[PDB]
Amino acid sequence: MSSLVRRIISTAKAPAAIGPYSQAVLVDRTIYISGQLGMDPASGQLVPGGVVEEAKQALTNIGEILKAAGCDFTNVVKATVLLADINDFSAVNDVYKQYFQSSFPARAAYQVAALPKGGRVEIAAIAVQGPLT
Amino acid sequence: MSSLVRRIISTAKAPAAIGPYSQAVLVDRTIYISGQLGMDPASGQLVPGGVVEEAKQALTNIGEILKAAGCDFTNVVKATVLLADINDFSAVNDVYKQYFQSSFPARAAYQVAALPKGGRVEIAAIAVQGPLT
Amino acid sequence: MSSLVRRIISTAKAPAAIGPYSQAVLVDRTIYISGQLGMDPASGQLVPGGVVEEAKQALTNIGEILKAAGCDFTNVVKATVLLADINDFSAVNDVYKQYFQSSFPARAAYQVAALPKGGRVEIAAIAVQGPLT
Amino acid sequence: HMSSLVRRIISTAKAPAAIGPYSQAVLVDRTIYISGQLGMDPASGQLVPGGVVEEAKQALTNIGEILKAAGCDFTNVVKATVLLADINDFSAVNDVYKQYFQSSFPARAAYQVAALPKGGRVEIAAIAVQGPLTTAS
Amino acid sequence: HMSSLVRRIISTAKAPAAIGPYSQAVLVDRTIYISGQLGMDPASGQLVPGGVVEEAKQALTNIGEILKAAGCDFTNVVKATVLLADINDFSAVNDVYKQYFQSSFPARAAYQVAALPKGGRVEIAAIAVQGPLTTAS
Amino acid sequence: HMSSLVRRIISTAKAPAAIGPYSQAVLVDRTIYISGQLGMDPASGQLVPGGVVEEAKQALTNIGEILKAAGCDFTNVVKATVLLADINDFSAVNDVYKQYFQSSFPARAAYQVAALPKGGRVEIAAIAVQGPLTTAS
């Protein structure tokens, strides 16, 4: 009946919350990361340029949340890729692969009906705090 | 190679199953909670009044499942909010915030094409059994 | 600050990856399984026959990934069932129940706008490596 | 940061009280460290009469009450230490000790010491692990 | 496969150096096994003068420096062993030992031995658990 | 409820058999408690001839076989106890013991006792932790 560590992860290097959620929660060694839209952290607005630029921004935001938790992309074990349009699958895959360079996470990827703020992509993730063997 | 505790959480204070699933599963210290529609526990029928009343009922149902597992809303670490209509985002956020009063979970929220029983909202969650520090 | 085990699960008894993901990731004792379409493992093509045959194939694929990790369906604690059409709920439930014969997982099930490859169903899961009590 | 592990000080009236800055036992995480027990009567404060066999019986009774206070029994013991005033009493003490265990026997340290507190002829200490335990050998 | 647990060899200059194939203490996972400490002056390499009370004070100072090197203090000690050259010195040594603990006291082993290294009159060893710890009793 | 932790009773024919209600070693969770080993020949049932140095070599051989039966080697030992019939034999025994360890040395207890079983001149016990272990100091 040990008391397990639970910590809210919060960094100004990622966007402010637009609803009642934390950027991520660390509990024991597992980090649950909220869905990230392609919002610029300074302004909270979706970056221009459509799905490719939004995907890059979403992943960069995930990277800053990971870093705040003492992690990097190699600590990610599962990701969820929500698309506004299934036709963008190939383009989003090519962006995604540039960040998750090895030990590729488990994943689910599919088209939803609509995302907050009219986003074209939103990515959530689960990570495990290192060290990992 | 310890044998980890796995327990099916089941309470008549939450709706009966409408498919082949458990209300929640506790494994080690993590509790995976099934998606809850706004069904009345006694009748299994969706409450009238649309998305706001359904969201309240769904969250109340989650609360009873948490309580059966010796938890409350403060043990939730991640939630998924599935909407039938993205226009309801603000209204559902305001209901949601009334239950998750602190240590806000990580979250993903988005519009799907359709929910079972024609629900307007469905909420799933992950919690960690306390004590948490 | 122990170093936790993280292992990529990979078996030729399940389909090759069609994107930048692992079939599953084992970390500590938790196994995150990627969404499985009803693809034949040998060819990578969706099996004919629609949602019922695809659901059977998806679940068989999950079973082979579990087996590669020293597990079976009784180790599953949470599943996500993504449908291309909510009208298929009853048919998919009846297939699903044939594999998850006891200790039914927690679950969320709902209709999405579109799945990769035009699939009619996709199933992801979380399992915990045994022994479980 | 790290998890906060549970510690319980065990203190039962059915075993001799721990006079001074020690405890009968300390449970930390799942491991229970049990202080050495003499053949002391909990209600007299000195040794039971009759010598080493009588003292061994009382010491093991005392350990059993401390185990029960920690939610354990003798099946949870993983290591014991048997200290003797006379090595030649080992067989007699072992004939008492063997009655408390049926299988999956603890590891053991046993030897004669120069002197025990209270003039004792035997003192038994133990380490136990809180269950459930699965024995695979 | 299993997780890789952390092990740290503790080696502080504020306690007597561990001459030869032993360490002052070993931390493994959360548990710290501390070698028996004599009343040795870290900078002389032999016992402090003045007998058992002076030696007990120095031994406990030495243990405290090893605990600090492992990120602990005396509140993390869960079991201690007090070895004596003379059982009749127990009360005097206990009056020193009690100053180092205020509550949640360790389990204890204590007895007279035939001989300690270096002609010591007291030697104290300990097991501690790295915090945080929550004491529920 | 709590997880069920693994316990294995270790019982190898390459070390002297544990006669009576004790085991050569008990593994529980990741920790192995190894009973004190004398310089006993596994196939004779009594001490090897030649005195303390010969007995120390045989005792350490016996411990090594018990470690191997638990899937460990001497690098997994975190604490050892060296009991002697004569404190003046410590250096000779240490010259044997040092051959079994190369670094990350165990914590140690060592002292002379009034009598060991079987008339032994040395008895070595140990605590080990099943690997993998990462040593960070």
Tab-separated table of C-alpha atoms in Angstrom, chain D residues 1-10 19-26 28-29 33-36 81 83 111 113-118 123 125 127, chain E residues 30-31 33 74-79 87 90 94 97-98 101 104-114 127 129-137:
chain	number	residue	atom	x	y	z
D	1	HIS	CA	10.713	11.147	-6.963
D	2	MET	CA	10.134	7.738	-5.388
D	3	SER	CA	7.088	6.088	-3.884
D	4	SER	CA	6.514	6.337	-0.146
D	5	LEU	CA	6.875	2.840	1.307
D	6	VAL	CA	4.787	1.700	4.294
D	7	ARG	CA	6.433	1.205	7.677
D	8	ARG	CA	4.588	-0.286	10.669
D	9	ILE	CA	6.020	-0.588	14.164
D	10	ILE	CA	4.664	-3.825	15.610
D	19	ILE	CA	11.712	-1.717	26.943
D	20	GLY	CA	13.677	1.229	25.544
D	21	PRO	CA	14.622	2.442	21.997
D	22	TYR	CA	13.786	-0.693	20.056
D	23	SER	CA	10.658	-2.300	18.735
D	24	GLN	CA	9.446	-5.888	18.747
D	25	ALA	CA	9.410	-5.749	14.975
D	26	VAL	CA	9.443	-3.306	12.047
D	28	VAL	CA	8.867	-1.952	5.863
D	29	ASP	CA	7.437	-2.474	2.389
D	33	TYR	CA	12.465	-7.475	10.806
D	34	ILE	CA	11.716	-9.193	14.151
D	35	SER	CA	13.927	-8.435	17.153
D	36	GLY	CA	15.542	-11.336	18.920
D	81	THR	CA	18.693	-16.744	13.722
D	83	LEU	CA	21.588	-17.963	19.301
D	111	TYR	CA	25.669	-20.562	16.827
D	113	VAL	CA	27.322	-16.647	21.743
D	114	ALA	CA	29.356	-15.396	24.688
D	115	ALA	CA	26.299	-14.011	26.515
D	116	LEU	CA	22.684	-13.150	25.774
D	117	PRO	CA	20.709	-10.446	27.584
D	118	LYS	CA	18.966	-11.486	30.784
D	123	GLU	CA	17.331	-16.203	21.591
D	125	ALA	CA	15.199	-13.621	15.685
D	127	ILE	CA	12.863	-12.009	8.957
E	30	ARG	CA	15.727	0.698	-1.540
E	31	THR	CA	17.579	-1.257	1.178
E	33	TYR	CA	23.108	-2.868	4.317
E	74	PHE	CA	18.784	7.593	11.564
E	75	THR	CA	15.031	7.740	10.945
E	76	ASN	CA	15.581	5.370	7.958
E	77	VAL	CA	17.075	2.609	10.111
E	78	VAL	CA	14.769	-0.394	10.369
E	79	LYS	CA	17.067	-2.948	12.105
E	87	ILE	CA	26.874	-7.795	28.270
E	90	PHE	CA	24.450	-2.867	27.549
E	94	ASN	CA	21.880	1.971	25.312
E	97	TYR	CA	22.162	4.748	21.378
E	98	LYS	CA	18.857	6.230	22.609
E	101	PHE	CA	16.435	7.845	17.799
E	104	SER	CA	9.545	4.472	15.290
E	105	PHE	CA	12.493	2.609	16.766
E	106	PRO	CA	14.404	-0.055	14.832
E	107	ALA	CA	14.164	-3.730	15.468
E	108	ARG	CA	17.301	-4.825	17.317
E	109	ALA	CA	19.683	-7.695	17.892
E	110	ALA	CA	22.077	-7.270	20.845
E	111	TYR	CA	24.420	-9.695	22.580
E	112	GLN	CA	27.975	-10.225	23.823
E	113	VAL	CA	30.440	-11.818	21.364
E	114	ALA	CA	33.684	-13.682	21.979
E	127	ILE	CA	19.785	-1.964	7.821
E	129	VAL	CA	15.489	1.860	3.829
E	130	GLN	CA	15.774	4.879	1.574
E	131	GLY	CA	12.834	7.244	1.924
E	132	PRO	CA	10.213	8.459	1.628
E	133	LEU	CA	8.654	6.159	4.261
E	134	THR	CA	5.102	6.465	5.693
E	135	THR	CA	4.731	5.127	9.257
E	136	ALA	CA	1.144	3.967	9.785
E	137	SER	CA	1.159	2.292	13.210
